[PDB]
Design an enzyme around this catalytic site. Structure first.
Site: not given
Length: 129
Positions: A48, A52
């Site tokens: 998306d 992280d």
């Protein structure tokens, strides 16, 4: 910084993660192992467009600002780079918010897939804690 297993266990304990929201210290060590291999500098892009960051692979859509994730909420009120430090304080504080969010440690898909239901206490065996 790449932590040793017991080294990380002691740091997480010091910062109050042992039994936080009812998750014993081995759960957090196991989660770190499978998210980052205990490496604070780990980063991974997601489909998306978020990324992280850090030992617990915290995501830039909800939790931290990386300057490139549109509709970022920055709920931990930190730059994502703070999650890469050798000092795990920011990662721990943000993990505490995440695990409080409603689904507990299921928020970490690596925990769900490789830690949940296993003997997580093994991850603190041999350590002086």
């Amino acid at each position: 910084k790449v932590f040793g297993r017991c080294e990380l266990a002691a740091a997480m304990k010091r910062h109050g993660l042992d039994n936080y929201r009812g998750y014993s210290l081995g759960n957090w060590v196991c989660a770190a192992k499978f998210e980052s291999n205990f490496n604070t500098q780990a980063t991974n892009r997601n489909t998306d467009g978020s990324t992280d960051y850090g030992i617990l692979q915290i995501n830039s859509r909800w939790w931290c600002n990386d300057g490139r994730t549109p509709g970022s909420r920055n709920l931990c009120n930190i730059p994502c780079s703070a999650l890469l430090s050798s000092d795990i304080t920011a990662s721990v504080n943000c993990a505490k918010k995440i695990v409080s969010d409603g689904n507990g440690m299921n928020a970490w898909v690596a925990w769900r897939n490789r830690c949940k239901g296993t003997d997580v206490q093994a991850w603190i065996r041999g350590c002086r804690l």
